């Protein structure tokens, strides 16, 4: 019943956008701009 999935383990979210709502880089932010508290796949599979 093993169902292991090789994930991509680099969640590229802007931490400044995630808990503030403002990023100093603006449109030149390397990571994506999203504010949500959903769990990741490895956090779900670990739980």
């Amino acid at each position: 019943l093993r169902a292991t999935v090789r994930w991509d383990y680099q969640p590229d979210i802007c931490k400044d956008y995630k808990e503030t709502g403002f990023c100093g880089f603006g449109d030149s932010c390397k990571f994506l701009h999203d504010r949500s508290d959903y769990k990741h796949g490895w956090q779900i599979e670990r739980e």
């Binding site: 292991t4 090789r6 994930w7 383990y9 969640p11 956090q43 670990r46």
Partner: protein, 67 residues
């Protein structure tokens, strides 16, 4: 100079010799390598990382910048 490594290992008291089926030896090498990569990870106190079995390094949780 020749300097045979395995004869130097067999000259000491920490090494022994036997005869073994090759599949058992390969399982022993894979288990030993996985066990000691976990030992290196636990030596560096990186309990939030995890080695797979198929040698896939993954974090358990989301990491801080120090981690």
């Amino acid at each position: 100079k020749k300097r045979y490594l395995f004869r130097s290992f067999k000259a000491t008291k920490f090494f022994q010799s036997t005869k073994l089926d090759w599949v058992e030896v390969g399982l022993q090498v894979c288990r030993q390598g996985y066990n000691m990569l976990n030992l290196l990870i636990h030596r560096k106190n990186l309990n939030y990382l995890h080695l797979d079995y198929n040698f896939n390094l993954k974090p358990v949780k989301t990491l801080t910048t120090k981690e």
